[PDB]
Design a protein around this ligand. Structure first.
Ligand SMILES: *[C@@H]1O[C@H](CO)[C@@H](O[C@@H]2O[C@H](CO)[C@@H](O[C@@H]3O[C@H](CO[C@H]4O[C@H](CO)[C@@H](O)[C@H](O[C@H]5O[C@H](CO)[C@@H](O)[C@H](O)[C@@H]5O)[C@@H]4O)[C@@H](O)[C@H](O[C@H]4O[C@H](CO)[C@@H](O)[C@H](O)[C@@H]4O)[C@@H]3O)[C@H](O)[C@H]2NC(C)=O)[C@H](O)[C@H]1NC(C)=O
Ligand SMILES: *[C@@H]1O[C@H](CO)[C@@H](O[C@@H]2O[C@H](CO)[C@@H](O[C@@H]3O[C@H](CO[C@H]4O[C@H](CO)[C@@H](O)[C@H](O[C@H]5O[C@H](CO)[C@@H](O)[C@H](O)[C@@H]5O)[C@@H]4O)[C@@H](O)[C@H](O[C@H]4O[C@H](CO)[C@@H](O)[C@H](O)[C@@H]4O)[C@@H]3O)[C@H](O)[C@H]2NC(C)=O)[C@H](O)[C@H]1NC(C)=O
Ligand SMILES: [Cl-]
Lengths: 301, 302
């Protein structure tokens, strides 16, 4: 057993059929020692007595809020969370993993240090999240995360729509241009009713980069079946652009889709369409990170 | 007098003819107090006695290793180095200054933070060098230098060729784009026998930059007395090249010389030669730092 916060404890439990439950002592926060009575918010009536209550916690009915009493007045209460362990593996049942079998997915629009991480939930009910820097060493990368919020966007995997959550974070001290020598290690604590689980992830900001689509994609014809297309770097992207260079792929219509797109490092090109869309996306010139969303415009005069 | 390291002390001395030497007390590192005697590695026999030896240090014979003894066994020893001061000036006799009358010359091939400093020596014998960050304040630039090594190259000044030393250094913390707001202040300690001197220098890495010569200098003709010459930035140079841009000068034949060289910011040009060499050197586009070495290459029927 271990303390999560004031008067909230987590109990690790082996979830095999014939497992011996953990015996946990819960003492009352009062100077008195007589006429002490205990109750649970999962059971009817008095379930114990004595200043210290000793119980065997195996099932989830053995969890919850245990309340003290003396002479009809309440005294204190302690909360029990369960951390399931089955076949040697810690449970991961509150969150739904993405197609790539990861649970936490983070992406950053630039190298400033700000980024967001997101996850999916199997059932959006009675949830409590909290995310922070897992490693707390001096040579760790300090991060200041916000509070988790339910997002309007709903990811659809298999034939099910999962609600997604998200949280924005900022790296404390930064030098965008500097090379990253060690990763950002994060940890999400997840609760659902009286179930406790936790998810961890490590990453370099360079690997999670995904620029925003190029802005001001304008049109200008040239001759029969030819048109010059121009654009400019997005406002979100890191500055100066001479250092944080970008490359672009250009495809035609009728992550990184490289089926029939041609590379252009400059911010303009000449191409033939005369019917259909001319779409262009961006990527960091020097590192193979995630590409941007497509920015499309028709091919009409 | 002041301590350089454990049991090694430096004595500042005015080297005018009739100068009063500095009196220095040397105590023994032992709990005993009787039968204590002193010797020197510059003098024969016992030169003193008592737990504390008091001597007048003026000449170099008064320097060296002073050893402590009791009952035939050695106890401890202290080393004395001399720092000469003549006409108010601290001596600079171990090192030979360059043509520009400086002693330390540093150069960097890129903005990484790595660089090297070099110096010359008048006589390569019984030398000990050590270089470090002179200022040790919080707002100073921290540097981690290596060990000084004798170089194969020998600079030739006047009518004599002098042996050269060099040491590579790295600036602890770096930010590629960042502007340098204060310089890198270094200090070299030099010893030769029992003589101590020290040399200092301050610089911004941007000022010591000297790129390496441009690589893959290929040729491709055009017409009678016309030919296109192309090259590419050197591998040592900082990246990305869109930020760390370079300039190039192109001269003809038959450390920026630029006597008859013409500027080209792009990595190629068309020029007339039809006989001779076409040489090209590089420089940082935006700062007037040192230029690179030259990269040279030579130049019927219907
Ligand atoms: C993700 O999820 C995992 C899985 O739960 C988290 O891992 C757990 O973290 C907690 C807190 O960091 C760990 O608890 C600590 O455990 C140590 C060591 O405990 C063992 O050794 C002790 C020796 O004194 C012993 O007392 C312990 O006994 C208890 O537990 C057993 C059952 O295991 C039970 O039978 C006993 O009756 C006891 O109740 C155990 O054998 C312990 O020393 C710590 O306590 C000290 O330090 C704290 C901090 O100051 C202090 O407050 C205490 O008073 C005490 O001085 C503390 O209990 C837990 O062990 C981890 N789980 C595992 C499997 O190792 C992980 O933290 C989560 N990560 C994130 C990022 O959220
Ligand atoms: C390059 O070369 C120059 C030239 O030598 C170096 O300059 C010298 O650096 C050293 C170390 O930083 C300096 O020594 C210190 O001196 C101070 C002040 O000393 C004066 O005032 C003292 C007042 O208490 C007094 O005691 C001193 O007296 C001694 O010297 C006189 C002769 O000058 C002699 O007659 C006496 O008998 C004494 O022996 C002197 O008047 C001193 O306070 C320092 O000591 C304290 O701090 C150290 C550090 O913690 C500590 O260990 C000590 O116990 C003590 O608490 C220390 O001795 C020296 O003064 C500098 N030279 C000059 C001319 O100023 C320079 O450092 C070199 N640079 C590089 C980068 O290598
Ligand atoms: Cl210099």
């Amino acid at each position: 057993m271990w303390e999560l916060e004031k008067d909230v404890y987590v109990v690790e439990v082996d979830w095999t059929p014939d497992a011996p439950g953990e015996t946990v002592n819960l003492t009352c926060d009062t100077p008195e020692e007589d006429d002490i009575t205990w109750t649970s918010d999962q059971r009817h009536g008095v379930i114990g007595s004595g200043k210290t209550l000793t119980i065997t916690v195996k099932e989830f009915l053995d969890a919850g809020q245990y309340t003290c009493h003396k002479g009809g007045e309440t005294l204190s209460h302690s909360h029990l969370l369960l951390h399931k362990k089955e076949n040697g593996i810690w449970s991961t049942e509150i969150l739904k993993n993405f197609k790539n079998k990861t649970f936490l997915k983070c992406e950053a629009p630039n190298y400033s240090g700000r980024f967001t991480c997101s996850w999916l939930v199997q059932r959006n009910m009675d949830l409590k999240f909290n995310i922070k820097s897992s490693s707390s060493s001096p040579d760790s990368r300090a991060v200041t995360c916000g509070m988790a919020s339910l997002s309007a966007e709903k990811v659809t995997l298999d034939q099910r729509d999962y609600e997604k959550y998200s949280v924005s974070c900022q790296e404390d001290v930064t030098c965008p241009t500097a090379e990253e020598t060690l990763p950002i290690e994060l940890a999400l604590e997840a609760r659902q009713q009286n179930k406790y689980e936790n998810y961890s992830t490590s990453f370099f900001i360079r690997d999670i980069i995904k620029p925003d689509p190029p802005k001001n994609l304008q049109m200008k014809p040239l001759k029969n079946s030819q048109v010059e297309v121009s654009w400019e770097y997005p406002d979100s992207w890191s500055t100066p652009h001479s250092y944080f260079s970008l490359k672009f792929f250009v495809r035609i219509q009728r992550g990184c889709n490289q089926k029939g797109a041609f590379l252009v490092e400059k911010t303009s090109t000449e191409v033939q369409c005369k019917g259909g869309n001319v779409c262009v996306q961006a990527q960091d010139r020097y590192y193979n990170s995630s590409c941007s969303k497509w920015a499309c415009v028709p091919c009409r005069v």
